[PDB]
């Protein structure tokens, strides 16, 4: 089965074979489709297709709701109705059979998304928001006009929202481990902390188990142990921004006495039910105002990282030890100890199907 859409006027129609285009890091799946035209109802002499990755965001200074500012990240276009001799490409398996079904008045089009481009990520809108989805999104548009720059009419075009998604790699990386050794003023004996996760890769909804080991040889007791999962998002719209948002946390009232060790295993599971109030939290790209999970980690193209546009999402686990205060300095120094563990949060490769939009609808 394939998806189709028609213009409000009804004389133009564009077909797509899917909505989620997988990104294999090295090369993205081609975007292919078939446009159904009507030459007698089309004296414009041209029909155009367009692919556009755009950053859309609601202004803060502007008091008007619904209106958003938009910026192009990558734009491509194609001639479709008059067969362009210079734009010849071989037809795909689905495209040729769509031509066979629809007949003469149906023409193909194909794009190729270049690598190192953002994946569809939607920032979570607050309850007071009313406009369209914010963040990075892709859109396929087919229209008719005597020239590229001629004013576009809403009734003479179609538009579909498509996504560029990534799935978990086939093999996990090395187990993430990290440690630190804090040395205090009073004595030459250090406070040692280690942590590690079971595996590098985690799926959405799968619980994260954190292993904590403490070797306290100092004269200060540990008051509390705090574990949290934080979502790191980098935005490179004009200049590189950076924000951190915690998505799950656990505080344990565990204490370590001097010259004593301690070991425990904590469990956490990031999920969206208890993060509804956090405005600006990054979520997977939405086609409409549906519900989607937390944004999956973006796989960078190894050592390229040429300030990828849009939003780059990554996760870490932070283990923090609260140390007692007093003595000479008291409340003036920073006695706490911390360490961070990075990990990957992604979907597995679907067997045959692409995602489905709120499968049991309300």
């Amino acid at each position, epitope marked *: *089965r394939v998806f189709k859409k028609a213009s409000p006027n009804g004389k133009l129609t564009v077909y797509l074979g899917k909505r989620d285009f997988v990104d294999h890091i090295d090369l993205v799946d081609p975007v292919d489709g078939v446009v159904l035209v009507d030459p007698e109802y089309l004296k414009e002499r041209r029909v155009y297709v367009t692919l556009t990755c755009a950053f859309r965001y609601g202004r803060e200074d502007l008091d008007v709701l619904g209106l958003t500012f938009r910026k192009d990240l990558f734009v491509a276009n194609v001639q479709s109705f008059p067969p362009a001799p210079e734009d010849k490409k071989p037809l795909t398996r689905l495209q040729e059979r769509l031509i066979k079904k629809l007949g003469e008045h149906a023409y193909p089009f194909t794009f190729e998304i270049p690598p190192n481009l953002p994946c569809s990520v939607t920032l979570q809108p607050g309850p007071e928001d009313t406009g369209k989805a914010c963040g990075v999104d892709y859109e396929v548009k087919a229209f008719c006009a005597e020239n590229l720059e001629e004013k576009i009419h809403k009734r003479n075009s179609v538009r579909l929202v498509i996504r560029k998604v990534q799935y978990a790699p086939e093999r996990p990386g090395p187990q993430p481990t990290a440690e630190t050794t804090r040395q205090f003023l009073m004595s030459d004996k250090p406070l040692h902390l280690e942590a590690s996760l079971d595996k590098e890769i985690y*799926y*959405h*909804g*799968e*619980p994260i188990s954190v292993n904590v080991h403490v070797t306290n040889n100092t004269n200060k007791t540990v008051k509390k142990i705090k574990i949290s999962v934080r979502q790191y998002a980098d935005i490179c719209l004009f200049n590189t921004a950076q924000y951190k948002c915690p998505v799950a946390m656990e505080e344990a009232d565990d204490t370590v006495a001097p010259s004593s060790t301690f070991c425990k295993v904590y469990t956490l*599971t990031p*999920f*969206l*039910a*208890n993060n*509804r109030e956090k405005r600006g939290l990054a979520l997977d790209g939405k086609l409409k105002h549906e*519900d989607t*999970n937390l944004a999956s980690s973006t796989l960078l193209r190894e050592g390229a990282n040429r300030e990828i546009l849009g939003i780059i999402v990554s996760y870490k686990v932070k283990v923090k030890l609260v140390v007692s205060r007093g003595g000479l300095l008291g409340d003036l120094a920073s006695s706490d100890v911390a360490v961070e563990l990075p990990f990957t949060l992604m*979907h597995p490769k679907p067997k*045959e*199907e692409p*995602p*489905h939009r709120e*499968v*049991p*609808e*309300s």
Partner: antibody
Amino acid sequence: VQLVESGGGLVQPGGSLRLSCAASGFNVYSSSIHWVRQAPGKGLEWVASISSYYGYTYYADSVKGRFTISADTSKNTAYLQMNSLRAEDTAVYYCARSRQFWYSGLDYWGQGTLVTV
Amino acid sequence: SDIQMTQSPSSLSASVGDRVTITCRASQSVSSAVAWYQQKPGKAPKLLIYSASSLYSGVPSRFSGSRSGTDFTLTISSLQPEDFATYYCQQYKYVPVTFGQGTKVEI
């Protein structure tokens, strides 16, 4: 991996019962747990649902207000609280599980508990 | 909105090795979101098909499902002696999720 439920038994109309379904091999955040009942000799019928990742609960129109569903994450158990059990609420209840990402049918079922009113 | 999934025949009889076709019709369009289950008397239903054409893992290949508009069909290429059970047809696109009335396959 297996689902098992307990709590069903004889009861008088208008009373209350607790059905608890214990999940093993998967966690309630990554799965959506449903309750499906089958009247004696009749076809299957869906009664309740819960999705712990998004925090949503759904009930059939015939049991809205009477039943209430909750899941406790600490031990991967889903509870169905039945109140004001009418005479027609007798059936064999199955605990079912469907993938949260994404729904692809009820692949795992319970063993079947009986509620007689 | 609720969707009544009229499923016929209510019960049929067939011999070993015969080809059996079961029809399930929806009152409204449900896309390809239809699942098939098999229940033997007294036991929990076992899932067979999801997305109306995709075989569930571990199910023998003789089971197949097809779609034609809103008429969904389950077909068994060669009916093995263990297949004589009750089949239920489910649509999972709209809450409430409605099952078919069910068909019985008997010797």
